[PDB]
Symmetry: C3
Subunit: 453 residues, 3 copies
């Protein structure tokens, strides 16, 4: 609805605002079941041969599931165990009587909340029943007609009912029993919508999940669990969006280098704090790898596992990078290569050396030839940006962008004492190394004065 962008010429960075949060903060685990016929040996025509081949497909899938059952700042992030919750629920299902308990609860209803032996109550869902189809609809037909089908529709009906089980088996077979995104075979759209509708979450959360079922699938896992007592069970671990509708901003950064003609005489700094930022419980959830988040219109879906919890003062780096409340993260170097960062509403261009950097229009061609340094163009009137031999299309989302003029902060650094190979550096750390270099010169020149006598 209302996306805005600000470019900071002094720090070669841009911020996009107007986004609303949808953050995965927890997990909800449901048990999905399929009823299976316990068939072993058949007592058997072209139509019967097709049924027996379909029965072999069914038997091999059951067998295969049984064997399957037993047998910049991303470096600062912690390490999670993504499916620890669903795997814990699955371990409980192996305990004596747990499967029979679910089989009894789902006897006449397709959905039921079941309390496991550990006190946890889970939503259980039966999505397919091949036990009643094979045992009470297919096998009695083969007996009353003494190995004759007659109706070809019987073959097609079994093929259609069996197909889902074969696809689920195929998926778990190539993914070692763990799949993500959760496919339509694991949970159809109506089953997922039905699951969200019964989840112990708010109406705003149900509305969000129901309107973004495709993002929910991407942020979910399906874990192959157990196959016993005529039951195939798998755990679908669904996201819990505990943080919704809080403001988010995306910070885009690009190298800021001096533009002196003398080769090997330039210095660079880059803001390393690029990423997604969302307000959350009085702090800011920072997602360094913005590519991990997913954007649907003005909504940003991020996962807290890919976040750092920072004080809201981190935003002051977008107001004044030399502020005293928060030590802004930067990296230093002497690598003045040319590149561009395509933002939400425009393009940051870092043009150095002899590189040809331009911004173009589909009707008029080149409309701007960038000069050396870090500049920006909005997507209004611009369709593409070219930096050397690389052409970038800009995003065409409607918004308002503001160019905040200012002298490149790299100009206020003495190149003689610049710490030019810092990566996990900050404004204060760079200043502390500069102070050490200046103090070592101060003490040397103090001795050269004292030695003059």
């Amino acid at each position: 609805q209302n996306i805005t962008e600000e470019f900071y010429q002094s720090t070669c960075s841009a911020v996009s605002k107007g986004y609303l949060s949808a953050l995965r903060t927890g997990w909800y685990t449901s048990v999905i079941t399929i009823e299976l016929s316990n068939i072993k040996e058949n007592k058997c025509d072209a139509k019967v041969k097709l049924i027996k081949q379909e029965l072999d497909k069914y038997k091999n899938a059951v067998t295969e599931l049984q064997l399957l059952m037993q047998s910049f700042l991303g470096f600062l992030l912690g390490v999670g165990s993504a499916i620890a919750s669903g795997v814990a629920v699955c371990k409980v299902l192996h305990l004596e009587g747990e499967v029979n308990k679910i089989k009894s609860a789902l006897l006449s209803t397709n959905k039921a909340v079941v309390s496991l032996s550990n006190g946890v109550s889970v939503l259980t869902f039966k999505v397919l029943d091949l036990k009643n189809y094979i045992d009470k609809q297919l096998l009695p037909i083969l007996n009353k007609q003494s190995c004759s089908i007659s109706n070809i529709e019987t073959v097609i009906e079994f093929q259609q009912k069996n197909n889902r089980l074969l696809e689920i088996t195929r998926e778990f077979s190539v993914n070692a029993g763990v799949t993500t995104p959760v496919s339509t075979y694991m949970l159809t759209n109506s089953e997922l919508l039905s699951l969200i509708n019964d989840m112990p979450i708010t109406n705003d959360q149900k509305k969000l999940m129901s309107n973004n079922v495709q993002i929910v699938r991407q942020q979910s896992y399906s874990i192959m669990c157990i196959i016993k007592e005529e039951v195939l069970a798998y755990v679908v671990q669904l996201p819990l969006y505990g943080v919704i509708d809080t403001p988010c901003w995306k910070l885009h950064t690009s190298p800021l280098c001096t533009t002196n003609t003398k080769e090997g005489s330039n210095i660079c700094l880059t803001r390393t704090d690029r990423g997604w930022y969302c307000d959350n419980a009085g702090s800011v959830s920072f997602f360094p790898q913005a590519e991990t988040c997913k954007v649907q219109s003005n909504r940003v879906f991020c996962d807290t596992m890919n976040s750092l919890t920072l004080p809201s003062e981190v935003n002051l780096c977008n107001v004044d990078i030399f502020n005293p409340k928060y030590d802004c993260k930067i990296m230093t170097s002497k690598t003045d290569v040319s590149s561009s960062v395509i933002t939400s509403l425009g393009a940051i261009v870092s043009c150095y050396g002899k590189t040809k950097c331009t911004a173009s229009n589909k009707n008029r061609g080149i409309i701007k030839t960038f000069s050396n340094g870090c500049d920006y163009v909005s997507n209004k009137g611009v369709d593409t940006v070219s930096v050397g031999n690389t052409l970038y299309y800009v995003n065409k989302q409607e918004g308002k962008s503001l160019y905040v003029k200012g002298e490149p902060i790299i100009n206020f650094y003495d190149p003689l004492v610049f710490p030019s190979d810092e990566f996990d550096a900050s404004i204060s750390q760079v200043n502390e190394k500069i102070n050490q270099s200046l103090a070592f010169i101060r003490k040397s020149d103090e001795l050269l004065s004292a030695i003059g006598g």
Copy 2:
């Protein structure tokens, strides 16, 4: 046809030449459409039950698509927005009358160039027509026979026509409306070949794309766009290979360490400029992550978004790393671990410490025991290389390789003043830090002479 390789003993690096370029420089967006029946409520036998279940599959896919519609040096690279072009074309399709315009243009032909309201002319393709099948071939059969199919072939024919739509829906459902590579369901081989044949590109480009359809699919996107007025539309964003048949070379690098017996006394340097290099418009497109490129015989498919535009003088680093025209990139360390880099025509082996490094033959077993340091073997007579507990198979592509002897450049560095923890360093930067260290010793010893009196 004509691949050659040179190993540089002095810099522990190798270059493979003889490759021809195929670089993705731009994008071409086409609109792919499927005609849909606007069915809602049916007026209905084993065969009719199968048709009604197939109609539910059709209705749920349409519904699901409607909900889907609204809701070393890689760190130097810029950031693009890969589908900004296709998404821009899609936004235009939402404007009033755009869909009807395409529906009219494709009324009697399966392909038509349509001019959108923004002046852009796009290739439009209708790949499937379920509107005529369901409304004029399936529904009238159910009315004239008063809910009777009789012909089982009717069920199978509908199942075959519907299958493509269900697969496209399944794909967009697990990929949030954006897929890559573009599958055969999105665009069949003949549809892709037909699209390439009508693209506004040269005959050499059509021949290249047509002979590498499998690479074109990998470098393409399918973007779910709009579903309205009996039309399902999706944008297929295809690569534009603006740079073809220019020479390419792959640079392979490996750590070069001193081989002194005293533990903790060794120093290392590694060329960090490894990657793919292609001639392009008077400059060199450098692809640091060579794994992003795809090689088909002597043709290398790279994407300019994954490139740096460098002066052609970067190649001088393969002639003389101490050249004055280009400042060659290196990293320094004191981590003399053993490893191997499998090249196009051989293997670079960095053997340090007590590690067992060998090169073997399938008929004779071990044929070479590497000594400490950085050495190389060609794939002629060699099938595998082993460095410690790691066995590597070498590529068996036919070619000619040359061993360029020379003293390891790490031997000419004073270990006492070696800057041993530089990553984004170069030959000049390492020399500048060495000069500072030597000058600090010079001034200290000048004071020790002046203090002697």
Copy 3:
């Protein structure tokens, strides 16, 4: 069976023991074949139209396969060429007579060991025969009935036989002839089990592969090779687990920072040697990217291509990080951000600044409020850990964990002379930089004493 874990308070790291190895050390390449009918023009009813459409699907797949045929410490790892072995075997299949040799060997048996012209003997497997089905079962039916099918079962039987070829074609079409994991369409479970059963490996290796078919698929490749003389051939490159049942341990590391109240006054160190470690041939195979390995109960599947061969003395870093036999790897910084590392049997928590860090229970909620610094909790009584706005579920695998108390080693470092921006650093390298800083102060103060007169 017997997983144990030790947390080291002094180094903010934990080790998990009790795992057994299954390491991919080599490759075994088999040739998989499909017999094809050489059909071109058909001499032809609703059932016959369905057969002719199925024949077009068959013809286009054959055509598409013919066009396909011609046209922290991970940075220390070497570079392999994963499919060099399978691609070498495939190149041999293109030589004159090689395909006919396999066609003759598989004439009456579905499996046969064939000796290629280069001396290599390979297991060959024919998984499907569409040549006999189309030429001797489908085409003669169309001739004797003068373009009449009569039996709808004929259409369904052809559709079922053809489906596998279309799926294999679809897979190679979207993966440029190279797929991984190897799907059930490339090799069914019984074909893979049959292949393992005939591989030239031990009974323990066959038992391991057969019990972990899903891991074998993940560590295998299918390479589209040649289509000629009524034969479709593809190479399935299978893992060789040359190292099995040797002990493995997983090392989990997290930042260890001082906890002083003064902002910007803290220093950090982190053990960078996190990863999987397996005993192997008298050395230790180290897998820095533990995420590359796969764990099935107490078995860890790793690939030697993702390993460093280290002396077994690397384990001494878990006994005493200041030991004289092995120089332990660490990184330094002044970035005291809060994070958690979920281990096999618990959670390491690095809590700094004003961050709220807790460990919770499903029955009692919060059961521990972490203090500043690096602490640990076991999974006994703990279900989740929260560090700021990030909630982590802990693994619930049964095991015994031990807390080894000790003063944080970061406390024994003088913050004034701490080298705080080292990444590829070690205990000795950090000590050497500290010595240089202390010696520069020593010589300055020696001159200030000599200048007093």
